[model samples]
Each structure stands twice: as structure tokens, then as C-alpha cells.
Target: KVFGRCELAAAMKRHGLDNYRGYSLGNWVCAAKFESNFNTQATNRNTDGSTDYGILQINSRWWCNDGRTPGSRNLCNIPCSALLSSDITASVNCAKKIVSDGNGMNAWVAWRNRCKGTDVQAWIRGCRL
Candidate 1:
């Protein structure tokens, strides 16, 4: 099966972001797709041989769920409902903080240059709020 625009949109939505152009949503996704195939259920092996979990490929080894920290609820530990809740505004925002912050675009620009032949143009074309 092939993943399409909705896949990226869903991941972006789950992270609470509005759009990709403004930030490096595409950039963060660069690693994410490689790491997890853009599949939320994707997981990687740890040195301890235990499994880490969740979308955006968050690992339980070093970080806790969203609510674990004060003033950091909804953003971090995104509930499935919340993730699939609205457009990708909230999820993308949270990811920006954790992954790229405000300047994620810098990383994105680099990704755009390197991964030029990928489906990025298609994604940008198909993406809608």
C-alpha cells in the first residue's frame, strides 16, 4: 500500500500544526518517514531491547507522555482523539517545540534540497486546511 497526502496531513494534524510551508513540517517528516514509514504503529529497537511507542515515534525511554510535565499537557501527550481531532494545527505546533521549534524551516529547506525527487511537491500540492 502507498501512503498519500492524507497520511502526512494526519501526522501533521496529530501533532497540532496548521500548515507545512510556514514551519518545517516537511523537514521533521523527513526523518519521521524514514524512521517509521509514516506509520504511527512504527517502532524501532533500543539498545536495552525494549520497545518504545506512540506517534511521531516518541520513545518512553527518556520522555514521558504529554501530561507528565506541567503546562505541557495537550501538546505533548496527544490523545488519539486529539490527534485525529482537528486539522493538523495543534499537533504540528507541539512537534515544532519538540522537534524543530520555530526555526524548523531551516531544517526543512535542507530537506527540500536533498529529498527533491520525493513526493514533497505532491504533498504541498494536495495539502489543505
Candidate 2:
């Protein structure tokens, strides 16, 4: 796996993994298949004049656009546009950091916790990842 379980699980621990562990790489892979054919570097222009890019579908205008940092197209990095370059890992990592501050898999952590008991709720919440 590009993101092995142990490594990402450790990273998630740093950010205080919640019930979101239900979301695995397989879950994310499924999401990618639906969202952008597993394209980590996906992007789209919004009606609000903002842009959404990366694996987690981060909004460029929502986060970037500082005009000073990287990935400014999103507010999370250096040159800003660099954040939106064709680098899926950078974009995905940026999204994860933006979501969980480097604990990328914590989204899964949150999923596991949020909908722990019921099968439908669990599956629904996992898909929320």
C-alpha cells in the first residue's frame, strides 16, 4: 500500500485519532475512484470563483489565495501555486494537513468514532471520508 497501515496509523496517533479509523486505504481508494478516478491532483473551478483541488478536494479559494505562500491557491504552504501543481502527494498531504495537521488518516479515525455502532451509519460515515 502507498500508505501502509502502520505508518499512517502512527501518524494518525500524533493527531489524536478518533473513531475515523473505519476509513481505510481501500475506502479512500473507493472514494478516489468515484471522485476523480483516483487522481490525487484533481481540480475544479467553483461558481464562487474559488477552486477546489487535490485528493481531499480542498478548495483553493477557501484555503489558498493568500498571494504570499506556496499553494496560495489554497493558504497552507509556500509559493501557494506550488500546492496546486501536478503533485498528487503534495496536494493530498496538503489536504490531510489542512484537515488533520499531518495526521492525514485521522479523517478515518473520526469516521470510526462518529458512527461506531450501526452498520448503515458506519458505512455512511466512512463514505463521508
TM-score of each: 0.45, 0.45
User: TM-score of predicted model 2?
Assistant: 0.45
Where model 2 places Cα greater than 4 Å from the true spot, the runs are 1-22, 66-74, 78-87, 101-129
lDDT string for model 1 (16-69, tens) is 554544543454555445545555555454565333333344433333343333
Residue-by-residue lDDT tens digits, candidate 2, 1-129: 133333433333343433333344444433333444434456666666665554445555546563433433444654335544544445545555555555444333323443323242222333333
Task: State residue 70's C-alpha deviation in candidate 2, in Å.
Answer: 16
The candidate that wins on lDDT is 1
Task: Estimate candidate 2's alpha-carbon lDDT, on a 0 to 1 scale.
Answer: 0.44
Error of 2 at 114 (Å): 17
Q: Candidate 1: misplaced stretches above 4 Å?
A: 1-3, 10-22, 65-97, 100-123
Span of 10 residues, lowest total lDDT, candidate 1: 66-75
